């Protein structure tokens, strides 16, 4: 991330309602890519789309994923260390394939686009595609 | 393959697109080039600046091909048989690139149709944009 | 799958013959060692070398592939039962099917070196990809 | 690890990079035809026999496995051994890093075909670690 790109992403992140966007992103990931429900079968009823999007534990875990995202937004020059602990949890303990990190990062982008519309310009999206790429890679660091 | 409910969500979503198909298809390309610059190497002959007449025109061709696919959901291999030969044999497009264009299309549609871009429609359009990709990556 | 692809698959599976279950067990043992994350789908299995559960499951996997070879024109119909199992019930991550198909190709090349031509290699990769797409469908 | 390193290095002394290289690159161009896009100057790639008998493919494949043999002697510094090659494949050739994994997987298949029972599952698992590291070191410039 360049200084100008970093300044644009941080300013836009100030508008993001993390609680709504986080629950919607994790919910959409469970609906569009249903094999991810395997890791959240403890959350209860995921049998239909409306159940997933209104599941209270999915909205709660999504805020946690986007807070972790927000914590990474403060350390754009050290993603590998900010997520080093989380990378080992998802790898050695949760066994989440690293392909799903980019899948969730891409769903988040779609969620940001739906939630902000015309203000989510292609230039801004490209900057956010850099961040989700770096976050997904930092989470996959303890696999390699 | 797409279910009956999948096909209905695709037909409904593309209906709300309407006369903005060519306009959304150009934006999806511009989003793909900006987010994934490796995809530019497939268009070295194109002017890729913002607002380019080439990018605008090709997006209309892409949108028209998607429109033909939505209207022929029961026979995607037949409706896109000519495009499958062009992409796999003539152009030899890396299949990972279709995932980038599909994602760019989903971002474009979600940005322009927020109230209609439900999780159910999101799941259907992703399943749809993946079938088109498989058809065009067939004949490999 | 083209007519030439189907012809290569039926020919290659004929050379396998009565060694299908034996090869299917090895391909599993190669998967579990090369890609240890695949082990998380078999927590009830003992996955050590020579395990009867790995041997048994490799036979069921090879039997499913033989059913798919004999029904190449209707893979969704021949594997609709297993597609429901791997998608709804097991929710297997699609990346894992690429790992098994690779492990199968390594096993087949190891035992059928003279028949594992590049044309057959390409056909078997396309068959195993279609079989996976069917199991990941729905 | 050290015991994995010793087994992988000992097995590599038996590999004839000459043939295994030309077969691994040819099989990549046949099994994954979109990679022919990067080798169109090599000439006739229209058929399987043309790819396998193409002299430039056999010649290039030897260089790829030589580069592989060079990474073999630097298993604790793959990122620095392939730093120049990473810049070439990422900044100049624009090869998607997914293809590095494809070539590494085809190489394993080629080793399994050429060595049979000697390419044990335990030995294959160790070699999968190498081709994963080589592919990651070659994709370093993208990140
Ligand atoms: C950018 C991507 C991701 C980030 C930033 C992230 C972050 C986190 C964080 C902070 C936690 C801690 C939760 C807590 O302590 O309460 C967590 C737990 C977890 N993550 Fe993720 N994660 C990501 C991707 C994924 C994906 C793609 C999956 C599965 C497909 C996944 C599966 C899980 C599971 C199963 C847990 C534990 C659930 C529980 O505690 O009950 N994560 N993750
Ligand atoms: C749903 C996905 C896609 C659709 C519907 C589509 C459709 C089309 C159409 C309609 C054309 C013009 C054919 C003609 O003029 O006769 C075309 C050409 C082309 N496509 Fe795509 N395509 C898709 C994906 C891709 C991707 C992902 C890439 C590269 C990353 C790509 C690269 C090209 C190139 C380089 C051309 C040549 C254009 C020219 O020379 O003017 N296509 N495609
Ligand atoms: C071509 C690919 C595959 C084929 C043909 C296949 C076939 C089968 C068959 C025949 C069964 C037994 C069904 C029964 O006994 O009722 C089964 C079960 C199972 N499969 Fe697969 N499978 C494939 C891929 C995978 C992959 C990639 C995974 C995980 C990484 C997987 C995980 C499982 C599990 C956990 C079971 C349950 C077995 C048990 O609980 O005893 N499968 N599969
Ligand atoms: C995965 C391990 C790989 C290794 C170790 C490797 C190694 C090499 C080496 C040593 C060269 C010679 C560079 C020079 O002569 O200056 C080269 C060139 C090249 N590589 Fe690779 N490579 C790998 C993968 C790939 C893949 C997957 C592709 C394409 C899909 C590719 C495409 C090329 C091309 C197009 C050239 C230049 C050929 C020419 O000059 O005509 N490489 N590579």
The secondary structure of residue D93, as a DSSP letter, is S
Residue C86 in marked binding region = yes
Structure token pair of residue C1: 């799958």
> Tokens 């079989």 belong to which residue?
C131
Do C126 and C5 touch, CB atoms closer than 8 A? Answer: yes
Query: Among residues D2, D20, D1, D10, which one has the least CA distance to residue D120?
Result: D10
Estimate to the nearest angstrom the gap between the alpha carbon of D101 and the chain centroid: 9
Do A73 and A44 touch, CB atoms closer than 8 A? Answer: no
| Run of H or E including D27 | helix D17-31
Q: What own/partner pairs with CB < 8 Å and gap ≥ 24 does A62-66 have?
A: A62/A21, A62/A22, A62/A23, A62/A24, A62/A25, A62/A26, A62/A27, A63/A18, A63/A19, A63/A22, A63/A23, A64/A22, A65/A22, A65/A25, A65/A26, A65/A104, A66/A16, A66/A18, A66/A19, A66/A21, A66/A22, A66/A25, A66/A108
- Radius of gyration over alpha carbons of chain B, in Å? 14
Distance CA A53, CA A75 (A): 30
Ligand in closest contact with the CA of A25:
1
Nearest CA distance, D105 vs chain C (angstrom):
7
Do B135 and B66 touch, CB atoms closer than 8 A? Answer: no
Q: For chain D, what is the domain count?
A: 1
- Domains of chain B, residue spans: 1-140
Do B111 and B103 touch, CB atoms closer than 8 A? Answer: no
Nearest CA distance, C29 vs chain B (angstrom):
29
Distance CA C28, CA C13 (A): 18
Q: Which residues contact residue B37 at a Cβ distance below 8 angstroms, ignoring those fewer than 6 apart?
A: none
The CA-based angle C15-C19-C21, given to 5 degrees, is 130
What one-character-per-residue DSSP string does A94-117 give?
A: T---THHHHHHHHHHHHHHHHHHG
Q: Which residues contact residue B131 at a Cβ distance below 8 angstroms, ignoring those fewer than 6 apart?
A: B1, B2, B76
State the method: X-ray
Distance CA C66, CA D25 (A): 30
Q: Which residues contact residue A105 at a Cβ distance below 8 angstroms, ignoring those fewer than 6 apart?
A: A132, A133, A135, A136
For residue A42, which residues of chain C lie inside 8 Å, CB to CB?
none
CA quadruple D101, D107, D110, D112: dihedral, nearest 10? -80
Distance CA C12, CA C22 (A): 15
The secondary structure of residue D77, as a DSSP letter, is -
Cα dist from B73 to A32, B127, B131, D100, whole Å: 20, 12, 10, 35
CA of D5 from ligand 4 middle (Å) equals 25
Contact D121 C29 (CB under 8 A): yes
Cα dist from D105 to C106, D32, D45, D129, D131, whole Å: 9, 12, 21, 11, 7
Structure token pair of residue C74: 């209707």
> Tokens 């592939």 belong to which residue?
C65
Structure token pair of residue C108: 């087949």
Q: Which residues contact residue C42 at a Cβ distance below 8 angstroms, ignoring those fewer than 6 apart?
A: C32, C53, C57
* Sequence-ordered alpha helix ranges (H) in chain C: 3-16, 20-34, 52-70, 75-78, 80-84, 95-111, 118-136
Contact A34 C91 (CB under 8 A): yes
Q: Ligand 1: which residue has its CA nearest to atom 9?
A: A65
The secondary structure of residue B86, as a DSSP letter, is I
Nearest CA distance, C120 vs chain D (angstrom):
9
CATH number assigned to the domain comprising residue A105: 1.10.490.10
C64 ligand 3 Cβ < 6 A: yes
Domain range for residue D88? 1-143
Cα dist from A121 to A118, B17, B30, D34, whole Å: 6, 19, 10, 32
Give, in words, the CATH class of B1-140. mainly alpha
Do A104 and A25 touch, CB atoms closer than 8 A? Answer: yes
Q: Which residues contact residue C66 at a Cβ distance below 8 angstroms, ignoring those fewer than 6 apart?
A: C13, C20
First to last CA, chain B: 19
Query: Among residues A124, C36, C19, C29, which one has the least CA distance to residue B30?
Result: A124
SS3 D135: helix
| CATH fold of the domain at C1-138 | Globin-like (1.10.490)
Distance CA C38, CA C42 (A): 8
Longest CA span, chain C:
41
Do C47 and C110 touch, CB atoms closer than 8 A? Answer: no
Longest CA span, chain D:
44
Structure token pair of residue C116: 């594992």
B36 ligand 2 Cβ < 6 A: no
Query: Among residues C136, C133, C96, B137, which one has the least CA distance to residue A99?
Result: C96
Do A65 and A104 touch, CB atoms closer than 8 A? Answer: yes
Estimate to the nearest angstrom the gap between the alpha carbon of B10 and the chain centroid: 12
Distance CA B115, CA B110 (A): 9
Query: Among residues D32, D21, D6, D36, which one has the least CA distance to residue D111?
Result: D21
Estimate to the nearest angstrom the gap between the alpha carbon of D134 and the chain centroid: 8
Query: Among residues C13, C94, C21, which one has the least CA distance to residue C57?
Result: C21
Structure token pair of residue A86: 């989380």
Do C49 and C103 touch, CB atoms closer than 8 A? Answer: no
A27-51 core/surface letters (b: 16 or more CB in 10 A; e: else): bbbbbbbbbbbebbeebeebeebeb
Distance CA D108, CA D119 (A): 9
Q: Using CB atoms within 10 A of its CB, is residue B34 exposed (0-12), middle (13-18) or buried (19+)?
A: buried
Q: How many CA atoms lie within 13 A of A85 on its CB side?
A: 3
Distance CA A65, CA A102 (A): 13
Distance CA A30, CA A56 (A): 14
Distance CA C122, CA D33 (A): 10
- The 3-state secondary structure of B47-62, one letter per residue: CCCCCCHHHHHHHHHH
Listed resolution, Å: 2.6
- Radius of gyration over alpha carbons of chain D, in Å? 15
Do A100 and A33 touch, CB atoms closer than 8 A? Answer: yes
> Tokens 């392939």 belong to which residue?
D82
Cα dist from C24 to C16, C28, C83, C110, D73, whole Å: 10, 6, 19, 13, 34
SS3 C48: coil
Query: Among residues D98, D99, D125, which one has the least CA distance to residue C106?
Result: D125
The secondary structure of residue A142, as a DSSP letter, is T
Q: Using CB atoms within 10 A of its CB, is residue C64 exposed (0-12), middle (13-18) or buried (19+)?
A: middle
What one-character-per-residue DSSP string does D1-24 give?
A: -HHHHHHHHHHHTT--HHHHHHHH
Cα dist from D74 to D6, D63, D88, D97, whole Å: 13, 17, 19, 21
Distance CA A27, CA D103 (A): 36
Structure token pair of residue C94: 């699609």
């Amino acid at each position: 991330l360049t200084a100008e790109e970093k300044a644009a992403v941080t300013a836009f992140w100030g508008k993001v309602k993390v609680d709504e966007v986080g629950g919607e992103a994790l919910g959409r990931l469970l609906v569009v890519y249903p094999w991810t429900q395997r890791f959240f079968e403890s959350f209860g009823d995921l049998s239909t789309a409306d159940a997933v999007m209104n599941n209270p534990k999915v909205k709660a875990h999504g805020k946690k994923v986007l807070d972790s995202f927000s914590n990474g937004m403060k350390h754009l020059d050290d993603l590998k260390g900010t997520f080093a602990a989380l990378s080992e949890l998802h790898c050695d303990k949760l066994h989440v394939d690293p392909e799903n990190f980019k899948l969730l990062g891409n769903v988040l982008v779609v969620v940001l686009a739906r939630n902000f519309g015309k203000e989510f310009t292609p230039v801004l999206q490209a900057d956010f595609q850099k961040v989700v790429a770096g976050v997904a890679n930092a989470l996959a660091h303890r696999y390699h | 393959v797409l279910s009956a409910a999948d096909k209905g969500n695709v037909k409904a979503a593309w209906g709300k697109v309407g006369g903005h198909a060519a306009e959304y298809g150009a934006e999806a390309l511009e989003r793909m080039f900006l987010s994934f610059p490796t995809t530019k190497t497939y268009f070295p002959h194109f002017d890729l600046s913002h607002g380019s007449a080439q990018v605008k025109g090709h997006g209309a061709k892409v949108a028209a091909a998607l429109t033909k696919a939505v209207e022929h959901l029961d026979d995607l291999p037949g409706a896109l048989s000519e495009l499958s030969d062009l992409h796999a044999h003539k152009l030899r497009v890396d299949p990972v690139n279709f995932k980038l264009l599909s994602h760019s299309l989903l971002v474009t549609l979600a940005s322009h149709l927020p109230s209609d871009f439900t999780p159910a429609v999101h799941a259907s359009l992703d399943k749809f944009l993946a079938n088109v990709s498989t058809v065009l990556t067939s004949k490999y």
